[PDB]
Ligand binder design. Sequence first.
Ligand SMILES: [K+]
Ligand SMILES: [K+]
Ligand SMILES: [K+]
Ligand SMILES: [K+]
Ligand SMILES: [Mg+2]
Ligand SMILES: [Mg+2]
Ligand SMILES: [Mg+2]
Ligand SMILES: [Mg+2]
Ligand SMILES: [Mg+2]
Ligand SMILES: [Mg+2]
Ligand SMILES: [Mg+2]
Ligand SMILES: [Mg+2]
Ligand SMILES: [Zn+2]
Lengths: 141, 210, 83, 23, 130, 98
Amino acid sequence: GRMHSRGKGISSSALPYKRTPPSWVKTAVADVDELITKAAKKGQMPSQIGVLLRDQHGIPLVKSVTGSKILRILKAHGLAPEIPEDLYFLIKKAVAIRKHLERNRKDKDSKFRLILVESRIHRLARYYKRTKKLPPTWKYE
Amino acid sequence: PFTKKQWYDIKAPLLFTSRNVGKTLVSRTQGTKIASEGLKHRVFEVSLADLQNDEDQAYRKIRLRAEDVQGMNVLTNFWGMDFTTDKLRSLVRKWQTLIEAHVDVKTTDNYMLRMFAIGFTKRRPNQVKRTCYAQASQIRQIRRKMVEIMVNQAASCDLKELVNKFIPEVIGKEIEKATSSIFPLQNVYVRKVKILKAPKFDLGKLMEVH
Amino acid sequence: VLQNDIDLLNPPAELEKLKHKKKRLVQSPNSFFMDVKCQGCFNITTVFSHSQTVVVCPGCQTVLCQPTGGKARLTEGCSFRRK
Amino acid sequence: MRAKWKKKRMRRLKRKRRKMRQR
Amino acid sequence: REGEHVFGVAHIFASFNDTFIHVTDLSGRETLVRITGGMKVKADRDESSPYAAMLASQDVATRCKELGITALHIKLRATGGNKTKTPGPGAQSALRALARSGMKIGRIEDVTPVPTXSTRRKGGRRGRRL
Amino acid sequence: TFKRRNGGRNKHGRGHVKYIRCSNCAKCCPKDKAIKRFLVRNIVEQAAVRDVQEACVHDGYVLPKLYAKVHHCVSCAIHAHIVRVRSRENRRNREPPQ
RNA sequence: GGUGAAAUUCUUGGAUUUAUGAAAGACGAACAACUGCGAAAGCAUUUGCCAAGGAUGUUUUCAUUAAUCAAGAACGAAAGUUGGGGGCUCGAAGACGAUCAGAUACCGUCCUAGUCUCAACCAUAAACGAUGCCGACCAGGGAUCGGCGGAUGUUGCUUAGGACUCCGCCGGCACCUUAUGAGAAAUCAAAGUCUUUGGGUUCCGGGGGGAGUAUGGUCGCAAGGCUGAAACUUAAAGGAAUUGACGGAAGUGGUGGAGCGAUUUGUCCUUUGUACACACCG
Ligand SMILES: [K+]
Ligand SMILES: [K+]
Ligand SMILES: [K+]
Ligand SMILES: [K+]
Ligand SMILES: [Mg+2]
Ligand SMILES: [Mg+2]
Ligand SMILES: [Mg+2]
Ligand SMILES: [Mg+2]
Ligand SMILES: [Mg+2]
Ligand SMILES: [Mg+2]
Ligand SMILES: [Mg+2]
Ligand SMILES: [Mg+2]
Ligand SMILES: [Zn+2]
């Protein structure tokens, strides 16, 4: 179940059973790694890096080829984001809704959705503080 | 009391085939009561089949405003058109989508017109579905196509050829052609034309079309 | 049909293809990668079938695929082969 | 007696008791 | 004058409480004859009755033949608005009266005023309780 | 005792439904609950049809019809015999008149 | 004009009716559905902008971050309150006209507050699916909406694609049949998987009244909301279903079968409602 709605969708990706690269994949491991480094260098987040490596390159899944995950690779080379990406996107949504409400006061629906968004932000921030991926005194306002 | 009323034959413009509208009446001329103000700006709701002598156009009504008095003959000009209530109530049926569009269009002679277009979704010959509905996005696409066509015709032309487009209803056929790629349509019509403002009365322009 | 008429361990392969990707014995994706062959230029340029990105030919030519809700639409006049 | 009218009657006695004891 | 048919416009207001037969020209700006159901019968219960409509339309036909009108256009309406939209009992009585009097009928159209929404109707949410 | 599964109306997956006003008594009834009939009659009674078709200037003239969608509350629909009380088994039949 | 019939009321100083035009304020018909969207309340004229959302698709990403929740918050129909604007229609209260044995009502007329909007409150509804939420399993079927995939052969169509057609998958509002189930039954495909009793969690009931009353507290300008007794009283109250009787509602065994059963079928006045069963003279 959706955390903040009654929707019960099950749409998702299904990783193949074979955890090894397909024979048609020939890109060397260092090649995909430095491609990831450039991708993060302009400012792409690991989800977008994976999307681009999937649809614009012959890389179906990074983990199959290299043996590591994109965020781990970026952390190894010191290009991981300070705020984790999901929290970054949730905070972006929250500030967008806050700007809209600063223009639109009567939008009670948007106020309810902002309450939900900030609840999600507090959940994810609590988890990241517990896992020490955020500063112990990191605060959202 | 009806002995001091003089009948003034009404003439439609030569745009229509028959110009034998009627013989509306007005009291005798008197102090500040000449017949001119009696017939001044009167509208005559008449059927199109009367003017066109074609019954198949009986669904359409034509409004004509009397703006001059040429002796005993009163000359009229186009003042909008509309459906009969029977036709409109016959077209609006359940289990089908209704598409409505209005637009404001200007002609070459400073005539501002609001044109109302009507359209209904059409069933296919092999349809098993008991309804024929268009999504709200498709309805918005068709309303866009209908309004762009209404603007394209009316703005380019003048009242005489604009009505010449109304009588065969070629605008409806072009809308049906242009929306067939979105959704098949049936009974596409320009249901109503309303003249919102008219230019300063020009007598020579009136005699041009009469 | 009646599951007493089948073996849950060896399901008929004909009816496994039509199951949701996650409701199979071992879940597998129904997407694939393809060697798209353009009109005249070589540019094999492997594409994801469900690509969310507008794939462009290397020589900055016209677009090759268009993102959609499901499978990406190859541009007019292009062939492909599964990989 | 209808429950709605019983409630209205009781709201009226309470108005009265309140306006008496408080004032 | 001498024409094929000197048409007129008959405004038939067929309410459930009365009936009006208003005959005008093609513009409606000139009233020629205005007969009423209760302007014939002396009982309020019968102003909407078919008998009053028949008498009213007979008087209208007489006056129209006097004025030279030989054909009529029919505009039949109910009360309209927020109120009822079904024509009263006198509508059919007036129409066949006019038809069975020698007067010709050009066109018949329903011109009941139909709101495209409307203001609130009288009677209360619970309606007329009888 | 619950008399009907649908509770005497047609409302699933939604909250408020705008009401209509009864054609007879001007009662406020929900649109999905009110009894709705589309009456297509003729402006001319079957009897006056011939007399009118005769007094017509235009030989080719199809007599115009009347189209009206009538809304009724339950009390007026039962009183006017638009709907009648049915046996328990027959109430579950939603088929239009055979 | 209005009604069953009238009357109150308007009207030769033109009522009602007809045509044209303008202004005002509401209201968004038909389309319109055992359809959609929304946490609920609720949401139906166009276009544009703003932010948000479900579902689907995904060989994108994180990696347990989750479920339900005292405390604490957000929203919350209508009516109602304070002030400004607006005030068409309708319309509590009020006045009058009827009806009436009476008629402070039902019916009719005129209408005040209100109905509309802004700011601030109020936090209540049969706010209902009278069914809290999350999760698993367990019948069949055909419709329908959203997305996706496949196969189609016709398009006033602009190869794709749209529109129809057919087959699937996921998700949604629902519907039909059936018991192998459950239930006091009505009925329910969940209200099933319960004496063969245990997936997680919140709220909440303990005969009927007194009583959502008193009092205290708290919130609110108020109206009131939330929390919430006792004394005392009582043998039933209540639910579902059956038969009969009634309606100012419409038009006799046997054996076998069904039902826990009263009963029923057979017997094709019937159906229907019932709080009546001394049976409506209730
Ligand atoms: K998804
Ligand atoms: K109903
Ligand atoms: K479905
Ligand atoms: K027996
Ligand atoms: Mg509700
Ligand atoms: Mg409550
Ligand atoms: Mg409740
Ligand atoms: Mg609930
Ligand atoms: Mg237990
Ligand atoms: Mg108790
Ligand atoms: Mg037996
Ligand atoms: Mg009952
Ligand atoms: Zn009614």
